[PDB]
Amino acid sequence: RXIXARXXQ
Amino acid sequence: SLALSLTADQMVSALLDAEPPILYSESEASMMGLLTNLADRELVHMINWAKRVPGFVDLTLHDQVHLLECAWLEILMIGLVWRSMEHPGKLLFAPNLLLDRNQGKCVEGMVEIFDMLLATSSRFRMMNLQGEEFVCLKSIILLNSGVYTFLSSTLKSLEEKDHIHRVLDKITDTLIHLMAKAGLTLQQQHQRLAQLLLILSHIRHMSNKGMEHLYSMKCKNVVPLYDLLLEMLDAH
Numbered sequence: 001r002x003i004x005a006r007x008x009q
Numbered sequence: 010s011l012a013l014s015l016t017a018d019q020m021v022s023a024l025l026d027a028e029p030p031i032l033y034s035e036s037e038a039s040m041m042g043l044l045t046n047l048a049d050r051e052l053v054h055m056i057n058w059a060k061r062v063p064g065f066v067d068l069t070l071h072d073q074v075h076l077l078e079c080a081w082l083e084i085l086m087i088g089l090v091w092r093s094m095e096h097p098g099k100l101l102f103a104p105n106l107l108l109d110r111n112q113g114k115c116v117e118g119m120v121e122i123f124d125m126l127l128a129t130s131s132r133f134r135m136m137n138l139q140g141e142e143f144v145c146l147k148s149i150i151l152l153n154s155g156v157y158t159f160l161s162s163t164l165k166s167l168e169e170k171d172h173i174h175r176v177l178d179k180i181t182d183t184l185i186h187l188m189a190k191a192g193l194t195l196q197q198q199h200q201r202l203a204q205l206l207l208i209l210s211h212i213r214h215m216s217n218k219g220m221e222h223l224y225s226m227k228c229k230n231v232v233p234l235y236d237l238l239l240e241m242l243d244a245h
């Protein structure tokens with residue numbers, strides 16, 4: 001459920 | 010909506026400003042260990058470049074993510090191949106890493122992918138792609154890969170779907186505007202637009218073999234555990 005999700009935001 | 014007013018100049022500028030920086034790099038395990046590490050590392054400036062692509066943040070946190078999981082390998086190679094373009098016979102993965110055809114055969118089934126990568130660089134070269142053209146293509150690719158694998162059941166992802174086409178259409182004008190600059194007939198112009206756009210599809214094909222290959226090397230536990238890269242895999 002994320003890094004992709006946190007960097008993109 | 011901001012994405013749709015900017016012009017072929019106004020546009021080709023932001024696609025330029027967003028450009029990621031040339032990332033330097035650092036047995037079959039090791040070879041793959043190597044491109045994985047660059048691949049993982051590029052895979053962050055890719056995200057960052059995606060956001061500053063007009064129309065993207067306009068997209069949805071969920072659609073943003075899905076375009077990226079769809080297109081990530083495609084953008085790596087469109088970029089790979091472009092970097093590789095003035096290096097006939099070679100894939101300029103980084104500056105400090107100029108891999109060659111035969112170096113692709115340090116990995117199982119890898120050479121062939123390389124072989125595809127290289128031919129597009131050839132194409133792009135002999136066709137003489139320009140950065141502006143490329144930034145264009147790259148965004149197109151980001152926008153069109155995951156476009157027709159959405160969850161088109163929510164009328165909010167049916168806004169989203171037709172948005173992308175509008176953008177995508179704008180982008181193609183941009184390209185057009187661009188090609189008109191060179192001074193080609195309107196034949197040669199859209200003779201071009203068809204030129205690039207096809208290649209993309211060979212890039213989808215390449216991304217696809219590539220995505221299978223990556224997944225297999227995962228299986229053999231021959232790729233490091235680059236958390237981000239790995240999670241790019243685990244959405245296919």
Ligand SMILES: C[C@]12CC[C@@H]3c4ccc(O)cc4CC[C@H]3[C@@H]1CC[C@@H]2O
Binds near residue numbers: 044219
């Ligand atoms: C995905 C692979 C590792 C990452 C490689 C890479 C790594 C960095 C980059 O800028 C482009 C590419 C395209 C080819 C990719 C490879 C094709 C098969 C392999 O799995």
